[PDB]
Amino acid sequence: RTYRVGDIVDIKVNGAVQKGMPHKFYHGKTGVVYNVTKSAVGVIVYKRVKHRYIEKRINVRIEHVKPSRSREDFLRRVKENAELKKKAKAEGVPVQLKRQPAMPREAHTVSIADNKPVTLAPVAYETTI
Amino acid sequence: FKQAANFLWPFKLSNPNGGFRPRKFKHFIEGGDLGNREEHINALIRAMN
Amino acid sequence: VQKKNPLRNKQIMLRLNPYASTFAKEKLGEVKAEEGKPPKVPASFKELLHEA
Amino acid sequence: MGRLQEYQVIGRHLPTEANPNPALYRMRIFAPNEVVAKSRFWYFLRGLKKVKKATGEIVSVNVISEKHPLKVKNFGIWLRYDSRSGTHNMYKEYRETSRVAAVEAMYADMAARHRARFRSIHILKVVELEKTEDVKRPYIKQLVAKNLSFPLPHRVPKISTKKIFSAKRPSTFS
Amino acid sequence: AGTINKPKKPTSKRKTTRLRAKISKRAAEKKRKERKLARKNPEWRSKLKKDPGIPNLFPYKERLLQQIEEERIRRKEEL
Amino acid sequence: FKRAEKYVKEYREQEREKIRLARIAKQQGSFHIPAEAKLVFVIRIKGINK
RNA sequence: CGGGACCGAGGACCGCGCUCUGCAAGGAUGCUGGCGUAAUGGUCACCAGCGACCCGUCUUGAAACACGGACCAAGGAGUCAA
Q: Which of F21, F25, F35 minimises the CB distance to A104?
């Protein structure tokens, strides 16, 4: 994989080489590529110090760098928003374009005839014996 | 509901008549008054309002 | 000049809600339940309740 | 641990595409209220069936009232309590008129005799001793004895605490 | 001993602030130290704890074992 | 006036509807799981310190 | 439906209203008594209950240590010029 400047990458140092890592803070962090080398890459990371963000730069080998999927959902949602909006304009019917948080469950009825409940104790009697 | 609740100012209640539980800063299921108490919030609303 | 409690002053209740007088006269806070003989609880509910 | 009620709590795993009808689990929980009963029910399922509250639901919460609260009964309680050594089994007996009163007497008894709290006690079984010969403990055996009759020696009279001074020395014979 | 007639100097139960703070710090450092040794504990631990079982003085232990057998035979027949 | 009358009637009907659904499930030998609550009142009972 | 305490802000009318000759509806009025003076009120001294380390400076993160202070009157220290 040939990485390019401006690409957003994830840092995952594979292997159990955590005995002598100088900086374990950037493991699992996501940053922007500014410099490309054959076996190295320059990553811009932002750290939070109290109320402000400080900007740090690291040099990570390509073996610990994978492309990130941060904007995949945004570009995808833009695409079906455009497509369903075109479809809604075609068929003349309103449609929802906004994703919503999970709503509480409604009322429903659970049958008992084939699903008789099992009475449980705080310990299992099979374990007691 | 968003517009109605944001139109409503936050309610400034008084301290409950009869008080809190003896150890106030524990969970409701532990014998305190923090956390979710489900339909038991109505008695606290009567006491504080 | 003075906020008056509508739950203590009936005039503020009638100003904010004209249906309060109709509610009080028709006693809509004391509506009895619908008539009819209630069917008894099924037995299997009782054995499920009292099952050890 | 308070004015306890016994609740039948039935819950289940949330239905999925793989499992459209999950199994239902029923427990008898002695709790002060329904919120505590549901919390203890989910705690026991996390301990046993690995079913979390966030992925499960409560189907039913009901109150189990005593059938005959006016009949004197003997109750045997098999329980486990946690101390600094670890977990221990205990079987105890209580002469009460309801299961909930037996459980409150149990909780007070364990707190008094072993300093065990609510979270350190697990109630495994509460049973009715239907026959007199099923009673094992001597402190219940002496109470279920034939023709039980005893006096009450040295009864201090009940005098109001606001009446500071008395004119005659009280008697402790009635 | 002649404690009744000639008692010695009393042992004060009134704590001092320096002693209370020092004892609290010692308790905190002991908790952190036993947590660290629990993390670096080389002693073998069982995956499943030893369960004591049912007490013998329980009057319905035999019918509980009967319930266990009918449950396990029912499970074996179902499986 | 008419709107308050409608609201009072709706509250009474929704309460009787929940009771009727629970009774129908109990009579048919099942349990009616009520809908989860949609409104929560939250009160801050601890101070602004630490 | 009672029993109790504290409060009376504003000062022609306007408004929302209702039980609509009027009103408990955008903030207290009506009736009555004693006194008309140290009676209310205020100041000073003292007693009583409760509360309350001696100020300034230095130090460090802070206390402590250290330094100054017998009392009073007058004087007494970020000014001017480029």
A: F35
Which pair of structure tokens corresponds to residue B7?
Answer: 């139109």
What is the CB neighbour count within 10 angstroms for residue D10? 21
Query: Which residue is associated with the tokens 């010695």?
Result: E8
Strand G nucleotides below 7 A of a protein CB? 9-10, 16-19, 24-27
Q: Are strands D24-31 and A65-67 parallel, antiparallel or unpaired?
A: unpaired
* Contact between the CB of C22 and strand G at under 7 Å: no
- Give CA–CA dist D26/E20, Å, rounded: 49
CA distance to C18, D41, D50, D81, per residue, from D120 (Å): 58, 16, 20, 6
CB neighbour list of residue D141: distance below 8 Å, 6 or more residues apart: D135
The partner residue sitting opposite C19, judged by closest CB among F4, F26, F29, is F4
Residue with tokens 């963000």: A53
* Cα separation values, D125 from A123, E68, F14, Å: 10, 14, 41
Q: Positive or negative, the Cα torsion across C17, C23, C29, C32?
A: negative
Q: How many CB atoms lie within 10 A of CB F13?
A: 11
Residue reference for tokens 């219940």:
D140
- Note the resolution in Å, 1 decimal: 2.9
Interface probe for A, chosen from E47, E49, E51, E74 (most Cβ of A below 10 Å), is E51
The residue assigned the tokens 């009808």 is D21
Contacts of B45 by beta carbon, 8 Å cutoff, 6+ apart: B13, F41
Between CA D39 and CA D56 the distance in angstroms is: 12
d(CA B48, CA D72): 43
Query: CA–C1' span, D61 to G14, in Å?
Result: 60
Main-chain dihedrals φ then ψ at residue D12, nearest 5 degrees: -155, 165
Give bridge partners of residue A56 from the DSSP assignment: A45
- Rounded to whole angstroms, the Cα distance separating A52 from A30 reads 18
The experimental method is cryo-EM
Partner-chain contact F1 C45, CB within 8 Å: no
Spatial CB neighbours of C20, under 8 Å, sequence gap ≥ 6? C10, C13, C14
